[PDB]
Amino acid sequence: SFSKEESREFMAIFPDIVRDLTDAGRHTDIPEVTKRFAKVLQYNVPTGKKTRGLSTVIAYKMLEKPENLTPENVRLAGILGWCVELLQASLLIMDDLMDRSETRRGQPCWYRQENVGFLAINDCLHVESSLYSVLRKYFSHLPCYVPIIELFHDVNFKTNMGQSLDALCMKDGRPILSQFTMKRYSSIVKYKTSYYTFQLPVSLGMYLADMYDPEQHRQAKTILMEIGEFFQIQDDFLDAFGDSQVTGKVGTDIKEGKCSWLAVVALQRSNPAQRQIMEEHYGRPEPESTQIIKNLYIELGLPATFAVYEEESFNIIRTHIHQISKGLPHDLFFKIMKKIYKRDA
């Protein structure tokens, strides 16, 4: 699980996905566009950690009867994982535009690159639409096809709802601090991250294994929602405190006024002088105001607060995994937690 050989097998599929989308004898009257789209895919799709794609394949191998794990079915799981990566890739291109970000995966964000700009918006829709072309090619004759397309449709819709709720942090260029509660936070991360990052890979593995029991999906969802919140809290910590040479990305939550876990906990922990600092300097374009907030986060001990939370939450999520039933493999959820716990990117 998350091994050297699994990574190889997974990356080996990527050149076939590019060929399927750009060199399959289709659209031969517009080679300018298909050759460019091959570059959009090369740049934007395969340079992340690939945890979602690799989790799709691990979930399938842990759910399917061993007797059924052929080179072809394990390749189908890897193709589904790449369709999750195409969805991720599409969401990041949009997200970086919305967040006015500088870098992604160690490079300038796509929209910033020479002669891209507002062509990144279309490129995000194009990458999203491409995953359904991949699904059609490989899954259209299998019983899992309709369930899988419906799941991608539903997760997309839910992710959009979360992205909106996330964006509604600011009104008239000031953040709505009095509404930055843990209740709000948990709602945002459920929709903007947990469905597509955790629920979607495991549900896809289930469907490819012909597991359709609604209660089995519900029990997986309950735990994966808890994992997703934990994973987004880690992301938020990285925005302010991560090493951008390691994470690949420069943080923007403070400048953008976001209802991040750090903002919520800062408001919980602040004395009245510190609350006035949030009121005056949170969600401002000026570099000096963002550093004032970072310095408040340092003085509050948010790094240590996060570290204590992460350890406590890891243990609570594992306790919950142990309570799972409906015939689900505990080690699948244990492996997912081991991969992300104490991550620095």
Ligand X SMILES: C=C(C)CCOP(=O)(O)OP(=O)(O)O
Ligand Y SMILES: O=P(O)(O)C(O)(Cn1ccnc1)P(=O)(O)O
Here's the x/- map for a second copy, 89-128, by CB under 8 A: it reads as: -----x--xx-x-------------xx--xx-xxxxxx-x
Residues in the chain, how many? 345
Among 64, 123, 239, 310, indicate the residue that binds Mn ion (CB under 5 A): 239
Contact 148, 139 (CB under 8 A): yes
**Token pair listed for 205:** 């593995």
Closest CA to 7 of 64, 37, 46: 46
Report how many residues bind a second copy under the rule CB under 8 A: 52
Please identify, using beta-carbon distances, which residue of 93 and 206 lies nearer to Mn ion.
93
For position 105 contacting ligand Y by CB under 6 A, the verdict is no
- Please, what is the minimum distance in Å from the beta carbon of residue 329 to a second copy? 29
- Does 127 bind ligand Y (CB under 6 A)? Our answer is no
Contact call for residues 104 and 94 (beta carbons, < 8 A): no
Single-letter code of the amino acid located at 126: H
| List 50, 61, 105, 192, residue binding ligand Y (CB under 6 A) | 192
CA dihedral sign, ordered 27, 124, 36, 119: positive
Q: Whole-angstrom Cα distance, residue 19 to residue 11?
A: 14
Question: According to the binding rule CB under 6 A, does residue 88 interact with ligand Y?
Answer: no
100 closest CA partner among 254, 303, 315: 254
Shortest Å distance, C-beta 105 to ligand X:
5
How far, in Å, are 216, 218, 331 from residue 327 at the CA level?
8, 12, 12
Q: Closest separation between CB of residue 11 and ligand Y, Å?
A: 21
DSSP 210: T
- Contact flag: residue 56 with ligand X (CB under 6 A): no
Among the candidate windows 91-99, 145-153, 274-282, 283-291, which touches ligand Y by CB under 6 A? Answer: 91-99
Amino acid present at 14: F
Q: Where do the H-state alpha helices sit in 99-118?
A: none
Q: Is 229 in the site for Mn ion (CB under 5 A)?
A: no
Considering only residues 85 through 104, tell me which ones interact with ligand X, judged by CB under 6 A.
88
C-beta neighbour count of 33 within 10 angstroms: 11
CA atoms within 13 A on the CB side of 247: 18
Under the binding rule (CB under 8 A), the answer on residue 229 touching a second copy is no
153 binds, among ligand X, Mn ion, a second copy, none (CB under 5 to 8 A by kind): a second copy
**Measured from the CB of residue 144, what is the shortest distance to ligand Y in angstroms?**
26
Dist. CA 300–CA 184, nearest whole Å: 22
The half-sphere exposure of 58 on its side-chain side, counting CA atoms within 13 A, is 22
217 sits near ligand X (criterion: CB under 6 A) = no
Tell me whether residue 235 is annotated as binding: yes
Query: Are 90 and 124 a contacting pair, CB within 8 Å?
Result: yes
Please report, as ranges, the residues that interact with ligand Y according to CB under 6 A. 91, 95, 99, 163, 166, 192-193, 235, 239, 249
Please report, as ranges, the residues that interact with a second copy according to CB under 8 A. 27, 29-30, 32-34, 36-37, 94, 97-98, 100, 114-115, 118-119, 121-126, 128-130, 132-133, 136, 140, 145-146, 149-150, 153-154, 156-158, 160-165, 167-168, 170-172, 187, 190-191
Please report, as ranges, the residues that interact with ligand X according to CB under 6 A. 48-49, 51, 88, 105, 193, 197, 232, 235
